[PDB]
Paper text:
[name] is a monoalkyl phthalate hydrolases discovered from [name] The structure of [name], determined at a resolution of 2.3 Å, exhibits the typical fold of the α/β hydrolase superfamily and is composed of an α/β hydrolase core (residues 24-152 and 225-311) and an α-helical lid domain (residues 153-224). The tunnel is narrow in the body of the structure, but significantly enlarged at the substrate entrance, due to the flexibility of the NC-loop. The catalytic triad, composed of Ser125, Asp259 and His291 with His291 bridging Asp259 and Ser125 through hydrogen bonds, is situated at the bottle-neck of the tunnel, suggesting this tunnel may be involved in the hydrolysis process of [name].
A catalytically inactive nucleophile mutation D259N was introduced in the active site to capture the transition state of [name]-[name] interaction, and the subsequent structure was finally determined at a resolution of 2.8 Å. Structure superposition of the apo and ligand-bound [name] revealed no significant conformational change on the whole structure of [name], except for the stabilization of the NC-loop in the lid domain and formation of a narrow hole extending from the protein surface to the catalytic Ser125. The shape of the electron density is consistent with that of PA, suggesting that Ser125 is covalent modified by PA. Additionally, adjacent to the catalytic center, we discovered the electron density of butanol in the penetrating tunnel. It appears that the butanol is highly dynamic in the structure, as only one butanol molecule with intact electron density in the four [name] of a single asymmetric unit. PA is tightly embedded in a positively charged pocket that is made up of residues His53, Phe56, Ser125, Arg126, Thr152 and His291 from the α/β hydrolase core and Asp162, Met163 and Tyr166 from the lid domain. In contrast to the extensive interactions of PA with [name], the butanol is only engaged one hydrogen bond with Tyr166. Of note, the location of the butanol is very close to His291 of the triad, leaving no space for a water molecule to attach the Ser125-PA intermediate.
Residue numbers in the entry:
A (entry chain D), B (entry chain A): 24 to 311
Write the structure that this text describes.
Amino acid sequence: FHTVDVKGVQTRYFDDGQDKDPILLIHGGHFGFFIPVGIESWGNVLEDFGEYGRVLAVDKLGQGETGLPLNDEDWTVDAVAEHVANFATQLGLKNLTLVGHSRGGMTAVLLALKYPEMVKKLVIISSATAAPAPPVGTDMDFYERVERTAPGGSAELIRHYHAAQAVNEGDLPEDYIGIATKWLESEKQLDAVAGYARNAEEHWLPSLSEGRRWVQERLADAGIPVPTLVVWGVNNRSAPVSMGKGLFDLIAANTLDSSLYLINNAGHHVFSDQREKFNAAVGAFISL
Amino acid sequence: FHTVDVKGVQTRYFDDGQDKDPILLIHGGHFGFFIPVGIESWGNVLEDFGEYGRVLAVDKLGQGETGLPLNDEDWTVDAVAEHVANFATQLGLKNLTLVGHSRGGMTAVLLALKYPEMVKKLVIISSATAAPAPPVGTDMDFYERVERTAPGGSAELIRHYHAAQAVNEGDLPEDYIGIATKWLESEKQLDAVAGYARNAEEHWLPSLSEGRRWVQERLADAGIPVPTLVVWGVNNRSAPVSMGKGLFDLIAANTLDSSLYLINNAGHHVFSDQREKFNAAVGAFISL
Ligand SMILES: */O=C(\[O])C1=[C][C]=[C][C]=C1C([O])=O
Ligand SMILES: */O=C(\[O])C1=[C][C]=[C][C]=C1C([O])=O
């Protein structure tokens, strides 16, 4: 692990130190999310992607051990993406491969769209955020449901969420439960929830909708400027496969160098649920 | 190459001879098909899958350089599958990975269903045959049209068909053209087409419908007993991606260990159209 200052924000990141083309991992979730998500959430892939390249994972704005956004105006999708981009510029990353999950996928997409010179490959995993908004309800309804039904307890909450989305499940690693718990009791987490509740309607959600609209625009125009791989779990409970397929149709419309991989007996956490196939497929995509 | 006798049928096959897990390639087409399909149709894949295992390719019944079925009763999908099974048994293939394309895909399924002891992994590529029958028309309508509009000439026919199906391909290799021309003009081809016209309605087509109904039954029952990969080209013209997806949905119902890979800018011959991606993905899948 390491810590650095990115445009006035204290950012924690992970670096493989290998001398290969870099792979940047952008995790899911957003600031103030009822579940803490961090570098450790990548779990085994941090080691597993060692063969395919120099692995880097970064804590997003206002998540993990990274600082909250400097201003309320920065509670936007674009601020997050720009934070990751500035982080990459700071580390002199080139020939980059972006692997994003959930909300991170959205981040990754934007970067690919906004900075093709830096990015060579893009991987989107189970990202309802990058995809068009659901026809009814919100992308948060599943999560609101899971939060409201959660039993008291910090670890109990995390296990509750894992039970909510795991399909090919086993108990979470104890270390991760400990770290995620530590994140959960943290004052920054409280501040994150407060910031979300404060800035969701004014800043975050509009940036989300406008972001989806922009991504859809680019997909209908020239598509993504880099080779794209979409990974999804057939049994994903938060985000249905249908929107994953639809997102693939939108990408495939004008992005010739693109592919879709659907894994059965997997949920939102495909890399966790079906680790070996995920590594085999995504790894195959990265090493070509 | 080599020739061996499989239940009284002269059978041509290719074996790289490596001491690795076997990969059996079953090519497309059926006996009497207006285009000859053989081991050579696999082209680069024959060398390319050398990395992933011991490659074997076999000419199907009444196809390539193998003899026509001995009896009119043997013009069935099950007879073809039985020929391939018998062939694999004679050479002592175990831990087999079945990779079937188009009609071969159907064969690949049957064996997987019928001989789990022999088969360890399954790959289906662009198989309208394995998929359910079309809601309107037949799986041959596309081909009947391609046949009827073809200009005179053997090479002219083969390039006509290639133009009909190619998406990211360039003019065919001359090496393949000579072989395909010789196959087309050969007396055996004439005998195969005549035999097809003779046995299509009574034996072959009922065997096809019954095969589809049976496969669907097994898929809805216990599914396939081996890890399965379904590969498809998004721009497939003979067999639309929708029916491919439908087939994957049918498989995924009870086959936990299954995946679907959709490749953009590829058609029926995915392995030709997107060679590097295809080799990467399928090769990664075969090696786990
Ligand atoms: O985990 C996520 O990335 C996420 C959070 C909230 C809504 C949707 C999503 C998603 O993209 O799966
Ligand atoms: O690929 C084939 O061999 C084929 C030929 C004729 C109709 C359908 C198919 C198929 O399964 O795609």
